[PDB]
Structure 1
Amino acid sequence: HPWFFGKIPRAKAEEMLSKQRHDGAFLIRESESAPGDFSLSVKFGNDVQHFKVLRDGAGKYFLWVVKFNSLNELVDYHRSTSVSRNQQIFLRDIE
């Protein structure tokens, strides 16, 4: 994969990414602070953001675990984030 860069140091990933013109330009590298893990480095503005690639028992890959403490929060969240994976459905109050 052309986005994988093996053991490039976090510092070098930033130098490299900081010279890209498009926000979103990224690369995946082996984590330096956490051996065995993977890190996603992405350009955005005058910064380079780093994300840790999370794993679970089943050995799955994900960046975030999005869950809610109440039905109230789940609802409000989906007023701006779609409830559907294949369609754009944003919750709107009945009228």
Structure 2
Amino acid sequence: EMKPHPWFFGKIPRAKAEEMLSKQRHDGAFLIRESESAPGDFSLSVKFGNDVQHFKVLRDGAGKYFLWVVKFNSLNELVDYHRSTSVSRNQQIFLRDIEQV
């Protein structure tokens, strides 16, 4: 019973993603947005404690997506990968869906 993903927020400003995620209770709560500072690139924003961390979604020459090293044919696969491998090199932070209304 296929539903849209609760993590894609399109073109919300960086600050608005911070505003929204700061109200989430659980570390790893996250969203993918379309960067305003680098149009055509995506960004990943993630709740951690009293902070919101931002990551560039990077592309290889073939248009595969990655944060650090492991890359995927889709944002959806990148997201899913990072539900169980940390997005961060300084903390263990695993992507989890927002609590949505």
Fold-level match, TM-score > 0.5?
yes
Once the two structures are TM-superposed, the CA of residue 49 in structure 1 deviates from its matched residue by 0.2
Separation of aligned partners in 1, 2:28 and 2:8: 15
How much identity, in percent, do the aligned residues show? 100
Kindly indicate whether the alpha-carbon contact (under 8 Å) linking 2:33 and 2:44 is maintained by their aligned counterparts in 1. Answer: yes
Instruction: Please provide the CA RMSD for this pair.
Output: 12.2
TM-score, reference length from structure 1: 0.68
- Ranges in structure 2 where 5+ consecutive residues have no aligned partner: none
Alpha carbons of 1:94 and 1:31: their partners in 2 closer, same or farther (altered >3 Å)?
closer
Q: Which has the larger radius of gyration?
A: 1
Match of 1:66 in 2: 70
- Cα deviation digits, residues 50-72 of structure 1 (max 9, x gap): 00000011110110038999999
Larger mean CA deviation between 49-58 and 82-91 belongs to 82-91
SS in 2 for 1:22: coil
- Ranges in structure 1 where 5+ consecutive residues have no aligned partner: none
Kindly indicate whether the alpha-carbon contact (under 8 Å) linking 2:30 and 2:97 is maintained by their aligned counterparts in 1. Answer: no
Larger mean CA deviation between 69-78 and 17-26 belongs to 69-78
Match of 2:42 in 1: 38
Kindly indicate whether the alpha-carbon contact (under 8 Å) linking 2:30 and 2:45 is maintained by their aligned counterparts in 1. Answer: yes
SS in 2 for 1:28: strand
Once the two structures are TM-superposed, the CA of residue 22 in structure 1 deviates from its matched residue by 0.1
